[PDB]
Amino acid sequence: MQIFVKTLTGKTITLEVEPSDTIENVKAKIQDKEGIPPDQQRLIFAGKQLEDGRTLSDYNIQKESTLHLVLRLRGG
C-alpha cells in the first residue's frame, strides 16, 4: 500500500506500508530511509499530530496521502 512523506525543507519520501502499520512503523521505516530517529519526528495530517501507537486506519489514511513530517529541535 502506498503513502508518501514530504519534508519540512523540500523533498518527498516514498513508502510502501500496510493499512495495519502503527505510527511507530512509519517512523522506523523512515529511520531506515534517511536516519531520522523517531524521537526527532512529529507527523501531521489534517491539522493533527499522529501519535505513535495508532494505525493508518485510525487516523483515516487513504492510499497515496502525502504527509507532512515535522521536527523537534530536541524536545519537547
Swiss-Prot record:
Site (described: Essential for function) = 68
Q: What is known to happen upon mutating residue 65 to D?
A: Phosphomimetic mutant that binds and activates PRKN
Tell me the ranges covered by the Ubiquitin-like domain, including all copies. Answer: 1-76
Q: Which residues carry this modification: Phosphoserine?
A: 65
Swapping residue 65 to G leads to an effect described as: Phosphomimetic mutant that can recruit PRKN to mitochondria
Q: Coiled coil where?
A: none
Q: What is the effect of changing residue 74 to K?
A: No effect on ADP-ribosylation
Q: Which compartments does it reside in? A: Cytoplasm; Nucleus
Q: Known post-translational modifications?
A: Phosphorylated at Ser-65 by PINK1 during mitophagy. Phosphorylated ubiquitin specifically binds and activates parkin (PRKN), triggering mitophagy. Phosphorylation does not affect E1-mediated E2 charging of ubiquitin but affects discharging of E2 enzymes to form polyubiquitin chains. It also affects deubiquitination by deubiquitinase enzymes such as USP30.
Site description Interacts with activating enzyme, residues in chain = 54, 72
Where is the Glycyl lysine isopeptide (Lys-Gly) (interchain with G-Cter in ubiquitin) crosslink found in the sequence? 6, 11, 27, 29, 33, 48, 63
Q: Which residues carry this modification: ADP-ribosylglycine?
A: 76
**Residues modified as (Microbial infection) ADP-ribosylthreonine:** 66
Residues joined by cross-link Glycyl lysine isopeptide (Gly-Lys) (interchain with K-? in acceptor proteins): 76
Question: Changing residue 65 to A: reported impact?
Answer: Prevents phosphorylation in case of mitophagy. Impaired translocation of PRKN to mitochondria
- Role summary: Exists either covalently attached to another protein, or free (unanchored). When covalently bound, it is conjugated to target proteins via an isopeptide bond either as a monomer (monoubiquitin), a polymer linked via different Lys residues of the ubiquitin (polyubiquitin chains) or a linear polymer linked via the initiator Met of the ubiquitin (linear polyubiquitin chains).
The protein in question is named: Ubiquitin
Species:
Homo sapiens (Human)
